[PDB]
């Protein structure tokens, strides 16, 4: 006549969002200590003027202007060059 279940899911679950990616893009002014990429790994390597926290977070060290170096795929660098 009717049915009695009984099944469910073992799924559903997921994890709260991890707002990643670059926050500071090609040709952008930058204050000292402004963050420029959140990333899982070495996706973007620090160049001149940019350091890297343990989160592999890239944060700029001395003001200036942001510049993206794509060195042919899998090896890429972000840097600051000050204006003048």
């Amino acid at each position: 006549a009717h049915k009695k279940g009984v099944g469910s899911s073992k799924n559903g679950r997921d994890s709260n969002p991890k707002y990643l990616g670059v926050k500071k893009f090609g040709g952008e002014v930058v204050k000292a200590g402004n963050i420029l990429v959140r990333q899982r790994g070495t996706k973007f390597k620090a160049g001149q003027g940019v350091g890297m926290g343990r989160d592999h977070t890239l944060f700029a060290l001395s003001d200036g202007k942001v510049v993206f170096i794509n060195k042919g795929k899998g090896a890429r660098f972000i840097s600051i060059e000050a204006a003048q």
């Binding site: 009717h2 049915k3 279940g5 099944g7 469910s8 899911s9």
Partner: protein
Amino acid sequence: KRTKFRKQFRGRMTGDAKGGDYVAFGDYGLIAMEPAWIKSNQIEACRIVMSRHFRRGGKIYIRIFPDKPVTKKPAETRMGKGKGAVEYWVSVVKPGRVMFEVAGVTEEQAKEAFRLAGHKLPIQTKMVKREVYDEA
């Protein structure tokens, strides 16, 4: 028929047929015309039809193959509580894709064995014959 080990469940979407529209392994070939789903048993049916009509032995190339799991919820359940559990298997045959290749048989034989397979099929078809040397 089935695949042997995998992941389990899937989805659905469509546009025209990737590869391959061309006639390898044989002299005569049967081609989809419609964006169907094709179940094992439907092929199984075409295989057995053509296999009988050719008797011994001819040569039969069943190009298409059901890797796609389709599910169906239990009988009389209110939606949710889960995803349906693998009812059967389909092969997402898009238009122009060649489903069948037969060779070692006359044109007549090929026509017939084809037509017979066609009437067992969810979708319109067309037979054709080589020249498609995009590669080999």
